[PDB]
Ligand binder design. Structure first.
Ligand SMILES: C=CC(=O)N1CC[C@H](Nc2nc(CN3CCOCC3)cc(Nc3nc4cccnc4s3)n2)C1
Length: 240
């Protein structure tokens, strides 16, 4: 990846913190500049060699002076979680399914590359023009998105990502509701262990909910891989 000198960046507006700015690179390209080390930089290098239409891209990294930063392409509509919330009531069900399909295409690519996301959730996906969804923050090596084998034993895998993808589906079809709202981490773990699952969102069809539930099977071996999920989702986009 290209290294970027901080003099090449113009910071126009802070858009996020707890530090992201809209800015320009070379007074030309709009960029999202994320301000903070070896870990942060390593994620950038991993992502700069993973090229898929549904995965966010980087222009480069800025190593000039601390705080260091990453320079990403600017996704015009922000994170998926906020976007679902601010546009509540304006989505057709097909648009919502299309969003899940976008994410799943990206995850199927990561799965094939043996890359485990570990923190898949609507807040880690971004929305571009024409409501295209890209997966973000996928270069790393919250109990509400965690599978049981993750919250009890730290056993991360693509199938644990599949569990998180079911929860993300629930966030999309519920248009940005918070899962297990007001329930404590302790409460979530207990509810899940006794077989509880998130309720069917009203914009979700019976078939969509079945797929959510296949993603939340107790045993990771019982969950479908993303490459299979992708086709299941696509099948339903015609009839279901
Ligand atoms: C949970 C939200 C979060 O972490 N955010 C970081 C910045 C992001 N906000 C944001 N806002 C915009 C512009 N608004 C969108 C809604 O309409 C009003 C304008 C854009 C934007 N774009 C980003 N692109 C990237 C690329 C890589 C990494 N982060 C981003 S944020 N983000 C929120």
């Amino acid at each position: 990846g290209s290294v970027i000198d901080p003099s090449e960046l113009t910071f126009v507006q802070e858009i996020g913190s707890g530090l992201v700015h809209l800015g320009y690179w070379l007074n030309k390209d709009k960029v999202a500049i994320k301000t903070i080390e070896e870990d942060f930089i390593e994620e950038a290098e991993v992502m700069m060699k993973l090229s898929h239409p549904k995965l966010v891209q980087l222009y480069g990294v800025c190593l000039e002076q601390a705080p260091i930063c990453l320079v990403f392409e600017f996704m015009e509509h922000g994170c998926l979680s906020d976007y679902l919330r601010t546009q509540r009531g304006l989505f057709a069900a097909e648009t919502l399914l299309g969003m899940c399909l976008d994410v799943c295409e990206g995850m199927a690519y990561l799965e094939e590359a043996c890359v485990i996301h570990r923190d898949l959730a609507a807040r880690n996906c971004l929305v571009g023009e024409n409501q295209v969804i890209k997966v973000s923050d996928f270069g790393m090596t919250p109990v509400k998105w965690a599978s049981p084998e993750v919250f009890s034993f730290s056993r991360y895998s693509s199938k644990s990502d599949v569990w998180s993808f079911g929860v993300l589906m629930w966030e999309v079809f519920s248009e940005g509701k918070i899962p297990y709202e007001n329930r404590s981490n302790s409460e979530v773990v207990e509810d899940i262990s006794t077989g509880f699952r998130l309720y069917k969102p009203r914009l979700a069809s019976t078939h969509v909910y079945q797929i959510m539930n296949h993603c939340w099977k107790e045993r990771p071996e019982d969950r479908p891989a993303f490459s299979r999920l992708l086709r299941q989702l696509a099948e339903i986009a015609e009839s279901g």
